[PDB]
Design an enzyme around this catalytic site. Structure first.
Site, PDB file in Angstrom:
ATOM      1  N   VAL B  46       0.838  -1.199   0.000  1.00 59.40           N
ATOM      2  CA  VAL B  46       0.000   0.000   0.000  1.00 59.40           C
ATOM      3  C   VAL B  46       0.881   1.260   0.000  1.00 59.40           C
ATOM      4  CG1 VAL B  46      -1.523   1.368   1.532  1.00 59.40           C
ATOM      5  CG2 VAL B  46      -2.123  -0.980   0.948  1.00 59.40           C
ATOM      6  N   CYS B  47       0.489   2.263  -0.789  1.00 67.11           N
ATOM      7  CA  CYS B  47       1.227   3.526  -0.873  1.00 67.11           C
ATOM      8  C   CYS B  47       1.201   4.237   0.479  1.00 67.11           C
ATOM      9  CB  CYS B  47       0.630   4.467  -1.933  1.00 67.11           C
ATOM     10  SG  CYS B  47       0.742   3.944  -3.669  1.00 67.11           S
ATOM     11  N   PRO B  48       2.322   4.875   0.875  1.00 62.21           N
ATOM     12  CA  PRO B  48       2.393   5.581   2.156  1.00 62.21           C
ATOM     13  C   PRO B  48       1.883   7.027   2.060  1.00 62.21           C
ATOM     14  CG  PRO B  48       4.530   5.626   1.139  1.00 62.21           C
ATOM     15  CD  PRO B  48       3.623   4.905   0.178  1.00 62.21           C
TER      16      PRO B  48
ATOM     17  N   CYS C 166       1.728  -0.237  -4.875  1.00 64.35           N
ATOM     18  CA  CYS C 166       2.118   1.122  -5.254  1.00 64.35           C
ATOM     19  C   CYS C 166       2.971   1.151  -6.537  1.00 64.35           C
ATOM     20  CB  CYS C 166       2.862   1.798  -4.091  1.00 64.35           C
ATOM     21  SG  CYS C 166       2.718   3.600  -4.021  1.00 64.35           S
TER      22      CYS C 166
END
Lengths: 162, 164, 170, 162, 177, 171, 165, 168, 163, 166
Positions: B46-48, C166
């Protein structure tokens, strides 16, 4: 109350093994010798020799028909990160199980309840799921991998010569 | 019953903050506006964005006297490693609390009991330890930092302006 | 334990919706996205901006397949009167549920037990009845409808996709 | 376990009386005769004739030393709004108590549990807080204020004639 | 836990009615309007005007399809004696139910626990057993049968003609004139 | 579990006695022999022979220092009415206690719970409040007053001459 | 709660009756009038007039179809000895039930708990096992047998003639 | 939970002893050796050899400072009658405790619950009230008074001693 | 739940040591390094080397300041007899604790509940009573004394300088 | 409460009998007279006279169809050692049951809980597994083997002759 000579309890944990994630259960251990190598935490300065020493004897363990399962209360996600950060940990070809719930750790009565981390315990388990050897040490005290191998050999000889 | 308008409970956790390990307790939150920013796990794919968005608003949060506490069930050791290895997390100048026991997470009733990870929650806490705003989201659904910033200003205004 | 990722409980309340009195239940929320907008009381001296902001985005919410349910412990009779009296509340074309029993409010653990009024809580609920987002605030701290709408868009995307991985932009 | 000849239990409710909000407790009732006039809801389609009928007899009630407390599960805020809305409710000089918690309503065993509203009940209470008359009716069956005044005068006669 | 708008509970009591004893149950109240008229005791020095008032309106009550059941914690044996003793009670042609167990009195939450006697209460019940009106008073505070009879006619009108209650719609914005 | 040789419990009931209403409590029974004579109901079709039979032997009981208390779940008001209506009950000079609460009846474990009426039971009580004789019968089965008198004389004799055993001798 | 108008409970006791031991149960009471005559103990210094008085009226009790069951907490062995040792008890032709367990006595709520002995209680029980008369007395207060017989006749008359007084 | 090496419980029973009626309690056992000789019933057809055998050794028992307490669920009245009827029971000069309430029997876990009678048990008790020897037998299996008397002498010998260690 | 890094619980057992019976409690272990060497039974056909192995390294253990406590569910009376019978067990200078109640064994969570015998467990304990190392093996699988010596030395090294 | 006239519980214990280890259960007692001779411990300084006295009477106990089971909370291994170390114990040709769990001992309500050792109790048990005679004594108070034999003969007689006049 004594865990020795008792069957391992069921589990379902995520793990990291050779650049990929897998799900590991008690079904995977049955029919094979198993080593549950518990330790406190990833990314600790203290002593990654323990995991590295077992990784140096892994081809001997595969010939002896033994699976190794390194366990801590960290996630499988951090095991992957730690496996890329440290050259000692990068040697590990065996599964690094993540146990954030503490369920696998609590099946072996091995939780530091104040810390939320597993104690330095090693459980040799036979193909029927019976625990044949236990070794626990306090923080800072190391477990030597040659002694582990001796107990594996000793357990296997007793298995075929009652 | 709801945690809204209740006092926060005592805690003792280790944390990573600006290249140094520190112990943080409820004593440190006393007299301070505090944001407890819970999240599931370090080193996920997951993107931060959630944590990076709070970092972008940190100079603005510093002008409101607000301390941000990022919390997960990972260790403070893992937080240091993530701060080095990620470009977005490296921006974080606020405390990253480790909660392996889950005691801090369970004080805010915010555990995923199946996963052993904290749900995505944000609690705004006033100088007397009272929870003034709660924001929880399911996995995938992000929370906006400028909305959090707006919510803090409103809470400060209400405290400063009793009755309207 | 958290209400996040739990199924909403059954209910049977009376509501005011754009001239008519109707009955609403958990059955009416099945197969539809739902917003349960709890607030303390009708005819207070607090500004009704919160309920007016949701009315401004109600076109967009309807196109997203989202039903809005404003809830308080006042009756549906009181909602009708407030809809006629207030210029801001007259805008709302969504259901104003009355909850004098407090049963619907207590399903969402949202009762001010001392006051007999609901706390300021918005719950986003999916077609399967699962709570995907929670937002609670104290008196005077408003909630933003643009933020609510952004979360619904996010919740719809995440329901239709697997866990995010991502790219190289972040 | 009938409420007749039992003392009223304590309460603390917000109320509306002649363009202001006040707090009323059981301490305000002691020493004086009281009428607790419960009704279902504000802003209903059903006539407020019962409430206006008491307003017409309120000057006569004040001569007899009798306070009127109209009670409902709506808030004191809605009472104010309904007082400025309706011509009939605008005549009310007496206190309109708000009972959103339902505590005052439950002290008189008068709550419709299915609906969260008080039933149409009138209680006559004496200076020692003792309930001397009870009247409860279903929706559409009226409560005659003339009958109410007869019972207070009857109750006051009995208090002075052991 | 208000009794109003609740169904009456089952009972089985012995009663006196027109020079003979009969058993009365909840099944006898089915399909008819019922007045349950509780009172403290037979042979007291307090006025018997309340039982006499209902007896004066009994011809009118029977034309409205309304049964009357006078109830107290005395026995049906005692009711007969009091019917022979007092000329006021002698008028009564409706049933005088005995309730020495207190079960019927407790069904209507009307027992004085310290005295073992029923309070002065009047309950109007419809053909379906649902309590439509309750009136309870202390010692010396009378109940006039004309007020009871008004409430019965109101209850009957609402049953036959529902939705014809007084509308608050001759007021506020929208009107009917 | 039995009530025999147990102390009577406190009570406070309204009663009718010789054209007058009075309050009777446990304090009134102190230092005197007391008969509690329970019966089901006033104004019944069954013959009131039991109460009439005790009335006939009431002088004898008063000479032995014995107070009689007739008890039922009817009120003291109906006792007065029954006293003037019935010829048999008009003979009663003793107290007719009313027990509409049932508290006195339940102190002697003598309530027909499904009827709300006391069973037909007679309890003999000494000056110290101790129950010396119990007698309970079903409907129809009558209690004899001359047997009740014999029991009281025996109880009074045993109180005055305790530690008495059987004699034997000849020649 | 009163034991009047309640059914007798099951029992199984050994009893002495005219030279031999027999077993008595609740099934032996079915269809017959029964008197359960409880007393404290055998071989006491109190006069056995109570039991003797009932023995004097036994011919009249047989006419009415009555079984007399004398009961104490002593054994049936002790009952046999007492029957050959006392002239008044030697007259007894009815069953002397032994109740060392105390179960029969406790079924009639008649145990002196601190003594382990039955109180002086007589119970008249009808053919359907329903208790129609109870009588209890303290030590030294004798039960009259003529009174007992009068109550049995009243009980039988009411059983046969419902309604009439 | 064995009764061996446990302290006897409080009791208050009536008894027949040598013509008199008396009351016996746990206070009366203090500072003396005691034998609680339980048996099922008086006036049975079973030979009363056990009680008469103990009666023959009662003179020797009293010189050793040992009281005997024969116990059954029959009354002290019944013991007095049985004492006169039988020649064997007439020899008994020791106390015959009645236990109709069954409390003393139940203190030694010795009740036949479905019969309401005590089992054939003997309990030797020391001056501190501690049970030093137990013997229980079924119906028709007799107890030997000489064997009881041997155990008392042994228990008295060991009472004033530490752990035994054999001489060889 | 884990015994490691917890304090030893109080006990009071009778023991046999060099031809005399002595009572051993937790108070006797306080201030010294202690080894609790559990085993199943006396007089078994199983190898008695495990006890003799520790006896062969006893001089080295005494220099390191280590008291050895052999424990089983047998009586101290039995330990004496076994010390006289076998030449291997006769070498034992250290205290052989008897534990017929199973109390000491159950303090270390080391009872075979279906057998009433202690498992083959070894607990190294520091002067403060804290358990620093544990080793448990199944029947047949031996414990070498040289490994016990290394864990004691490693535990002592960590105690002297933690860093 | 009373253990007399009750059926013995099922058990499974290892035992030593004439240079040989065997398992013994309640199945082995079914259809036989059984003496369960409990005692505290092996290798104690107390005289082994009790067990040696029963050994002197074992030949005639076997004639009468009676099995003897010496029981202790020691192991069957220690029983072997104690049989070869003492001349009195060496005479024992009957089974020496080990009860390290205490299960057999606890079935007869015979455990010294603070010591972990069985009390000095003897239980005579018939072919139907019913306990006909119980004898418990404190330390130092010896149990006579001839009295046990006299009781067994009486128990066997009562079984063969049910119901008696005298």
């Amino acid at each position: 109350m004594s865990l020795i000579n008792t069957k391992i309890k069921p589990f379902k944990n995520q793990a990291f093994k050779n650049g990929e994630f897998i799900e590991i259960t008690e079904k995977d251990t049955e029919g094979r010798w198993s080593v549950f190598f518990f330790y406190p935490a990833d990314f600790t300065f203290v002593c990654p020799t323990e995991l590295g020493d077992v990784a140096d004897h892994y081809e001997e363990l595969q010939k002896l028909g033994v699976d190794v399962y390194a366990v801590s209360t960290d996630t499988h996600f951090t095991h992957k990160a730690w496996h890329s950060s440290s050259e000692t940990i990068a040697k590990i070809k065996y599964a690094m199980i993540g146990d954030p719930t503490g369920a696998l750790t609590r099946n072996f009565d091995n939780m530091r309840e104040d810390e939320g981390l597993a104690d330095r315990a090693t459980f040799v388990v036979d193909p029927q799921g019976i625990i044949q050897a236990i070794e626990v040490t306090a923080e800072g005290i190391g477990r030597d991998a040659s002694d582990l191998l001796r107990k594996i050999k000793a357990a296997q000889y007793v298995a075929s010569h009652p």
